[model samples]
Target chain A: MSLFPGDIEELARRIITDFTPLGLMVSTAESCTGGLIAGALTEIAGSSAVVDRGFVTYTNDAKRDMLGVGTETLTTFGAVSRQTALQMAHGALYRSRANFAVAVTGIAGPGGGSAEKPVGLVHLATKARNGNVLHHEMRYGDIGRTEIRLATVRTALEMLIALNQAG
Target chain B: MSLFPGDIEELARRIITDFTPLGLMVSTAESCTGGLIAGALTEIAGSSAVVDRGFVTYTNDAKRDMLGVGTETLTTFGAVSRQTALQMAHGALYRSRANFAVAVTGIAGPGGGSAEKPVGLVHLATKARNGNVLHHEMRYGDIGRTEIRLATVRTALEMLIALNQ
Candidate 1:
């Protein structure tokens, strides 16, 4: 019985264990998942060593201010686009003292979905300090807001792990 | 019932309902509770209207960088002190377009406890746009990390509601 349900704590603990030994720290740039990725990372006992500040950039202004996401990028690619996700990862790495940064932007919705970019459409990008970036596009379907957000957390944690291994 | 195991969603809904109508946007600055306060607020359906952004400043560097908590205040009063919490609220209000900024700093832990400041000692502050600030200090005992954090979330939500009314 952990703070987050079912394997979330397990994955988060693994992330801390794997990264803390290497003096690796991570920061999150979140939109649809709000701050859950950072929340899960900080749930671990000694997580402060591995977790930096999280940017809950739910608004475009926040995305631009907290991270350095360009307005041109947002206007051209849209917030949920792959380009925006990549830029968010870049902005996070540039802003924080993190070796790795994970950014998620999506429409986790009961209402904010369209035919083109339906609900549960999330774009995740993880950036390494060495200039490596990985992108994942998840079509979680209309799986309700809670599930989509939690799934995004799981995926982001996995990306953090993979980012470490790749480094 | 809800994502959170209490009347959290209910209270969050009430906050959204009250604040959204008044065109009031809120930002969160969190530490001990991590990002749960922001998470709870964003759980509501129309939350985007009332929630601008959240700062999860779990480190001292983060506190200084993200929410602009003064280094002297943190070094003097400590990160979990009322001084740091108040600065975090003020910084959040200054950083974003939020009408109300709520900040929390505490030790929710199985570790990080001391004789003077135990595990569940949290300081919370809420700042209104018009220069009003409210502060609350909670000594939740050593009620485990999870309980302390969730309780902080509840307290923050209540503060937001009160900040609205």
Candidate 2:
């Protein structure tokens, strides 16, 4: 849907190529961007081979209940924080039985932006191999809500690729 | 991804094709299947023009907090019941400026089954342009969790087509 420098489709293609050989599956736990990252993967023709499933835990309570993300992590770190994203990624891997998992939580907003956590503030985490959580925090500089989400999807895919390659 | 009938993709394509012209958008609140319905629509290239957002409030508390699905409905009907789905559809339409919305709450499980509500039992409610809620309850036999969720996506796309056409 976006044609920016870091396109989500290109990122997904790379990860798919890498994981296809290893017979590994990837799962996602998404929040502010909804299922855009998962949706991007499923757009590929043979995605069923690699994408086990995705959990769109758009709220804090869903993260805790569905994915077993702890409430303390959510309350202390809020939704768009590294701590919460790591727990969510771990939970997604457990729930989906996927070898690699990526979780994203963010404020992609026309509203709900604090001074500290402004809009386009995204926190991404990937749990890979034997459960190492790699984390990244970025501010996409108020690049409009849709563009912000599209950008985050690209970043998540790149991180997934990095995790898979490094492992 | 699903090869059963290729009907889900057909329905999803038509929904996006027909609605984007009329400026209709849809949102979702999911439980057991997560965001499969939303993920389906977004597979289409121009989905952002039609899909306002999706709420994957897989837990009762998140349903209340994010989608404004009330605790009363959850307490009375449980999260996987028609009453909760109805409230959730209403909440989605009201929270965003979407013309129509759908809410799915189901037990697509291999583990969570009971005499009253077994696994593969799903309750889906679609709120239309008039804000009227139409409900559908389906008991797709024990086809494992993935099949049940794929069936739910097909049903949801069917409901969206009905609303658009």
Q: How much does each candidate deviate at the interface, measured as C-alpha RMSD after superposition?
A: 1.4, 10.3
Q: Write the per-residue lDDT of candidate 1 for residues A84-149, one digit (tens) a residue.
A: 899999998889999999999999898889988999999999999889999999999998888888
What would the per-residue lDDT of candidate 2 be over residues A1-167, giving only the tens digit for each residue? 22223356677777777788899988888876668677567545355567765666655555776578888887787878988888889888886657998999887766778899998899999997596788999898776766777778888998989888787
Off by over 4 Å in 1: none
Scoring only the second chain, what is candidate 1's TM-score?
A: 0.97
**Docking verdict class for candidate 1:** medium
DockQ of each model vs. true complex: 0.72, 0.10
Error of 1 at B79 (Å): 0.5
Q: CA shift at A154, candidate 2, in angstroms?
A: 0.4
Q: What's the TM-score of each model vs. the native?
A: 0.98, 0.58
Write out the backbone clash pairs for model 1.
none
What does candidate 1 score on TM?
A: 0.98
- For every candidate, the chain B TM-score is 0.97, 0.93
